[PDB]
Amino acid sequence: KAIHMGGWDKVQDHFRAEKKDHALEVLHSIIHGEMEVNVEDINKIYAFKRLQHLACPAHQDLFTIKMDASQTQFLLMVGDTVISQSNIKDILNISDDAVIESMSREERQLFLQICEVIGSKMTWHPELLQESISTLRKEVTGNAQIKTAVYEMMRPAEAPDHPLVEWQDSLTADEKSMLACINAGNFEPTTQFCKIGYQEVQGEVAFSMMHPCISYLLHSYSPFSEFKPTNSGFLKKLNQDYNDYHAKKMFIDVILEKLYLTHERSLHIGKDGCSRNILLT
Numbered sequence: 001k002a003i004h005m006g007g008w009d010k011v012q013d014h015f016r017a018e019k020k021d022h023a024l025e026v027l028h029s030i031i032h033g034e035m036e037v038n039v040e041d042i043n044k045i046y047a048f049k050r051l052q053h054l055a056c057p058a059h060q061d062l063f064t065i066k067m068d069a070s071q072t073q074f075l076l077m078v079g080d081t082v083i084s085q086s087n088i089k090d091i092l093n094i095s096d097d098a099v100i101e102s103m104s105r106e107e108r109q110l111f112l113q114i115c116e117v118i119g120s121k122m123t124w125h126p127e128l129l130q131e132s133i134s135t136l137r138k139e140v141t142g143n144a145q146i147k148t149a150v151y152e153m154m155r156p157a158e159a160p161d162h163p164l165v166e167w168q169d170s171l172t173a174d175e176k177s178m179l180a181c182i183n184a185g186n187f188e189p190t191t192q193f194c195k196i197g198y199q200e201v202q203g204e205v206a207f208s209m210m211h212p213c214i215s216y217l218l219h220s221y222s223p224f225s226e227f228k229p230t231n232s233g234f235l236k237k238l239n240q241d242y243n244d245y246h247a248k249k250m251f252i253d254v255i256l257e258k259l260y261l262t263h264e265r266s267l268h269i270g271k272d273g274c275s276r277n278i279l280l281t
Contacts (some may be wrong), residue, residue: 004125006031025050028123036092038225039122041086045112046119048076048084065112071102074112091115092213093220093223100213101239109210110153114217117146122223133222141218141280150218150279154197154210157265164270164277165263175255181244182209182252184237193267193277195241198260205265207256209245211281212238218280 002009006027015023045065052063053196062079074091076084089096103111121128121139129136140146151160167189171179176187195215197208212235220234245252256267263269268277 005124024124032123032126037223038090038224038228039119039223040221041090042093042115043119043123044076044084044086045074045091045115046117046123049116049120051078067108071108072100082184088213089121092219092235093215093225093228093231094235095228098232100235100241101211101242102215103211107152110149111211111214111217113149114140114146114214117143117218118221120146129223133224136218136223137221147280150214154208154279156199158198158268160278160281162266162268164268164273164275165266167269167271168262170258170262173253175258178248178251178255181199181248182241184241189269190271190274191276193259193269194279196256196267197279198256198267200265205257205260207253207260209242212242 003024008024008027011027012020012023017260048063048065052060055063064077066075066077067073068075068085073085074088075082076086083181088100089098092100118136118140121136123160124137127140151158169189179192180187182195186192189225197210198205200206215238216231216235220231220238222231259269260267268275270277
């Protein structure tokens with residue numbers, strides 16, 4: 001897809017095809033009204049990918065990212081050498097005394113994948129956010145392999161493309177109350193389930209909630225430095241729902257199971273054709 005930054009459309013004509021990626025990396029370092037932005041940590045993730053991609057194909061396994069024992073620092077590793085690190089609160093642009101819930105190994109790899117994509121849009125397509133956050137985000141949330149990765153982890157048997165099932169309300173007033181917490185104390189059938197995943201495993205359906213860092217980074221993240229505390233507010237909220245859901249999981253799952261079984265084994269529930277119960281679109 002065409003890169004345009006730094007007049008690249010015509011500037012690229014000065015370079016041999018085999019040098020264009022090198023010249024872009026350089027052009028990127030020359031060029032990168034305007035609100036101040038905090039993206040040095042988050043861009044490391046995609047930059048590390050760019051590094052790895054230049055190494056001999058058999059050395060590529062040697063480039064990896066892990067966490068320190070506290071899982072609050074990502075460590076960029078070239079074999080055993082830690083070439084650089086990033087605090088997760090700096091990657092997230094969050095206000096520091098902000099609570100981050102821990103992620104499984106699966107969830108972390110997904111978080112990092114979203115980091116790559118975001119980093120790559122902000123690096124090669126700065127025009128995107130120059131418009132608005134929503135224009136950046138559309139490109140991230142609309143992105144094929146991110147879509148594919150989010151569905152594969154949370155709803156492995158549902159295609160991202162899955163057509164909505166029509167809402168049929170079999171919930172008692174108590175059940176709708178019990179559900180309020182997975183969507184900020186509201187009960188709206190078209191949105192209540194946007195954070196829930198599910199998979200069938202040896203005859204049982206197992207529900208989950210989207211990790212609040214992953215939902216934050218998909219739908220609430222602002223790279224702008226100046227609203228650090230606003231980002232933090234959004235995160236605490238997703239934290240709270242996440243924690244409520246786990247405190248009450250054995251009541252909530254009974255009800256999810258009922259809904260899933262009565263909506264064609266999906267929680268991608270809509271009304272009059274209008275769902276926002278997708279994980280992301």
